Structure formats: C-alpha cells, structure tokens
Design a binder for this molecule. Structure first.
Ligand SMILES: Cc1cc2nc3c(=O)[nH]c(=O)nc-3n(C[C@H](O)[C@H](O)[C@H](O)COP(=O)(O)OP(=O)(O)OC[C@H]3O[C@@H](n4cnc5c(N)ncnc54)[C@H](O)[C@@H]3O)c2cc1C
Ligand code: HEM
Ligand SMILES: O=N[O-]
Ligand SMILES: [K+]
Length: 398
C-alpha cells in the first residue's frame, strides 16, 4: 500500500544493503542505552560482539527489497516470530522499536533523510510490524503453556567434558503435564534466568534445544559451558546454569518453539537418505531427530556426521552409538578438529550422498561454511534445513 511510499522505500535499498549494519548498530546502542529495561530481554552479547546487528540489517533490507509483496518473507517472519514469542515480545513493545529504527535511519542517512523518507519508513514499519504481531499472536495461541512457567531441575549430567544435560519437570500447579506435551524434534525451549555472577543486574533469556522428543520423565536440554579465556568473560547463563543452578532449584521456561523439524513424510521411506551434520553442542536437536528416526523407521539410510574438538568434548557418545546400533543402514562419521581438517566440500562430496534430506546445526560460522558447501555441491534448498545457535537472519542472503 501507497505507491509513492514504495518507491521511496526502494530508493533506500542501496544504503541498507551497504550501510545497513551502521543503522542497526546505532539502533541497538541508542535504544538499549536509553532504555535499560530492555536489557532484561535483549542479549547484550549478541549485539555488542555477535551477529544480531547483521540479522536485523538483513531483515530490514529484505523488507525494503520486497516492499511490493512482503508475503515473500513469511518463512523468515515465522522463524523470527518463534524467537519473539519464546521471549515474550508483545504488541506494546513494537512502537519503541519503530521509534528507534526511524531515529537510527535518520541519524545515519543525515541530510539524505528528508521528512518524506522518514514518513515512508514509518508507514513501512507499521505494515511490517503488523505482520509479525499477527504471526506471533497465532504462536501465542498454539504455545503449549502460557508465558514463563516454573520447572524444577531434577538432574544435571555431563554428556561431554564441558556439556551438561539438564532434566527439568514442571512445578506442580504450573498446569503442565509431562505426559501430554507433544514435542517435535528440532524445537528449543527458552529459559528466563537472572545470573548472579559478574555483577549481573538483568534477566537473561536463552534458547536451548530439546535433546529428546520423549518427555515422560522430564524435558531435557544440554548447555555447553562458554568458559572464560584470558580477556573475555565466561558465558553468563551457561556459567550460571553450570555452577549456580543446582538439582532441586527452580528454573523458568517458555513453551517449545522453532521451525527446525525433520520432514515427517520422509521418516518412513528408504529411498531418500537422512544426513545429520553437527558441530559441537549443535548435536543436540539432531540427537532428538535421530531418536525419532530410529524409533519410527530404523531401516532408513542414515549418515551421522559429527564434528567436535576431540573425543572428551564430543557430546552424547554412548547415546548416539546405542541409537545407531539399532539402524540397519548407517554411516557414522566423526571429525575431531584438534587434529583433523575442518569439514570441507570434498569431505561432504565423499562421505554423504548427492541427493539427501540434510539437517545441520551448530554455531553461525559453522552453518555459513556448511551451507556454502552444500550449495556448492548443488543440493536443492528445500532439502537443506539448518538451525544456527545464534541469529539465523545473519546467515541468509536477501
Ligand atoms: C535456536 C537456538 C538454539 C540454541 N541451542 C543451544 C543448545 O542446545 N545448547 C547450548 O549450549 N547453546 C544453545 N544455544 C546458544 C545459547 O542460547 C546461548 O547463546 C549460549 O549458551 C551462550 O549464552 P551465555 O549467556 O552462556 O553466554 P553470553 O554471556 O551470551 O556470551 C556468549 C559468548 O561470548 C563471549 N563473550 C562475552 N563477552 C565477550 C567480549 N567482550 N568479547 C568477545 N567475546 C565475549 C562469551 O565468553 C561466550 O563465549 C542456542 C541458540 C539458539 C538461537
Ligand atoms: C517489525 C519489527 C521487528 C523486526 C523486523 C524484528 C527482527 C528480529 C530479527 C531479525 C531477530 C533475529 C532472529 C534471527 O535472526 O534468528 C530478532 C530477534 C529478537 N528480537 Fe526482534 N524484531 C521486531 C520487533 C521486536 C520487538 C518489538 C522486540 C522487543 C522490544 C524484539 C526483540 C527481540 C529480541 C529480544 C530478539 C533476540 C535477540 C538475540 O537473540 O540476540 N523484536 N528480531
Ligand atoms: O532487533 N529488534 O528485534
Ligand atoms: K524506556
């Protein structure tokens, strides 16, 4: 809607494409300096030293390039919406983001941002914001339970030298029944914690993938310890969960979220193989999926490709071997990067079939590298699914 508006928006594509991240960095710095209450929601680390500014810049760019038809973006809007919904973002949060976005645009564009250009962006923001609010309302409706609910930590077990699997059960009166919780392998939960070390003053929200779609004996997720290396601090919430949150303590969770999921129609057939490709703690939702595959159809050709620094840091070794031993047609491919090369294109060409249903998960950089290889091996987009442990929109070409 609005024809002169849409040309104005399009005329800013070049600045967003080349300077978009100057805009988004200014945005975060101003909004969070001026509005420290949002530090209870935004992950300081992703913006100051992570890829959050690139995720936003790419999304704003995609919206500007598709201003005539925003429906093109719906898969990205749903992906982001699942995170917003898990984080408890509501309609009444949207106007402040719009204020600060328009202000960052004005600041960066300078004399190249007249009132008409700003007005148009206000209009574009309203239309884009209305879409997200709508998707998210649906997600609030479908959520398995409402808002943050209290769980008790019932177990904490090392699944590698530096990865701890948490088992959580809902506190009685949370209205949550473990036997009546349909999980799709690939989903993550979100914790709302308030770490006490490092002079922390804010809540800290983090996503952790579910290790299993079985819930009867509690929900399970695994946290890698982001330890302190001379200079930079230990990861705030991973440290808090490893060292401070004991068995018996309460932790707050919002309901399972996310669009990462194994293709349900391909589970039960044998012609199309499954490739599960992980790095480090990225293994966690892939274990969930391997579990589902093996329980539903153990005859499917499966390729388990798992990279880690070394054997002690390789997570779920016994678990994975036991699941794999049940499969009649499996290749297990383990990489240890302390000695062995980082998985490259030739490795993938040699160790996995040309036409496969591929699910890959790990750090944003590992995802960027692996997608680049899978595209270079001519895999079709619709057979590559991935979940970066960070902002997915920083991994997408717009
Ligand atoms: C969909 C999704 C699923 C995820 N699933 C999992 C999972 O299953 N398991 C898991 O362990 N994680 C998972 N994550 C990542 C997880 O949510 C957290 O981001 C992770 O635990 C790190 O959080 P933290 O608070 O411990 O570290 P943060 O305090 O946010 O710090 C993050 C990293 O930055 C470093 N750092 C801090 N300050 C600086 C600085 N000044 N300069 C340079 N570096 C710095 C820290 O040491 C740490 O390594 C997932 C993320 C997403 C988006
Ligand atoms: C139309 C408006 C909005 C857009 C276009 C947008 C866009 C995005 C994008 C691209 C991401 C990163 C997700 C990913 O790449 O995986 C994100 C995450 C996030 N968004 Fe929004 N968002 C909007 C509204 C809001 C509002 C109103 C708030 C709250 C005030 C909010 C809070 C957050 C938070 C807390 C995260 C997680 C940040 C992190 O993980 O570091 N968003 N959003
Ligand atoms: O970065 N605003 O989601
Ligand atoms: K404020």
């Amino acid at each position: 809607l609005a024809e002169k508006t849409r040309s104005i928006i399009k005329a800013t594509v070049p600045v967003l494409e080349q300077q978009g991240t100057v805009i988004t960095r200014t945005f975060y710095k101003n909004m969070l300096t001026e509005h420290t209450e949002l530090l209870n929601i935004f992950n300081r680390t992703n913006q100051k030293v992570g890829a959050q500014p690139n995720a936003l810049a790419t999304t704003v760019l995609a919206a500007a390039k598709n201003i005539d038809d925003l429906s093109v973006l719906m898969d990205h809007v749903k992906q982001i919406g699942h995170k917003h919904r898990a984080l408890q973002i509501k309609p009444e949060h949207y106007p402040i983001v719009g204020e600060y976005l328009l202000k960052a645009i004005k600041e960066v564009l300078g004399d190249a941002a007249t009132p008409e250009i700003i007005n148009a962006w206000g209009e574009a923001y309203q239309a884009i914001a209305d879409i997200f609010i709508t998707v998210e309302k649906k997600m609030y409706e479908e959520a398995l339970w409402p808002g943050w609910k209290p769980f008790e930590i019932t177990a904490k077990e090392y699944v590698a030298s530096d990865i701890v699997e948490f088992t959580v059960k809902p506190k009685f009166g949370s209205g949550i029944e473990l036997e009546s919780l349909p999980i799709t392998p690939g989903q993550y939960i979100t914790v709302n914690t308030h770490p006490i070390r490092q002079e922390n003053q804010y809540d800290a929200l983090r996503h952790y993938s579910l290790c299993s779609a079985s819930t009867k004996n509690g929900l399970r997720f695994a946290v890698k310890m982001e330890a302190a290396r001379e200079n930079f601090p230990a990861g705030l919430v991973s440290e808090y969960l490893h060292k401070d949150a004991k068995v018996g303590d309460e932790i707050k969770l919002s309901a399972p979220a996310g669009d990462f999921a194994i293709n349900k129609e391909l589970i039960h057939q044998n012609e199309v193989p499954l490739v599960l490709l992980s790095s480090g703690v990225g293994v966690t939702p892939l274990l969930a999926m391997l579990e589902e595959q093996v329980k539903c159809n153990p005859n499917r050709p499966i390729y388990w490709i798992q990279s880690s620094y070394d054997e002690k840091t390789q997570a779920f070794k016994k678990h994975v071997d036991e699941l794999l031993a049940e499969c009649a047609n499996v290749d297990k491919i383990i990489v240890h990067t302390d000695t062995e090369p980082l998985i490259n294109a030739a490795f993938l060409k040699e160790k996995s079939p040309a036409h496969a249903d591929v699910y890959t998960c790990g750090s944003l950089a590992f995802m960027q590298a692996m997608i680049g290889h899978l595209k270079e091996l001519e895999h079709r987009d619709d057979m590559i699914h991935y979940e970066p442990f960070g902002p997915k929109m920083s991994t997408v070409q717009v």
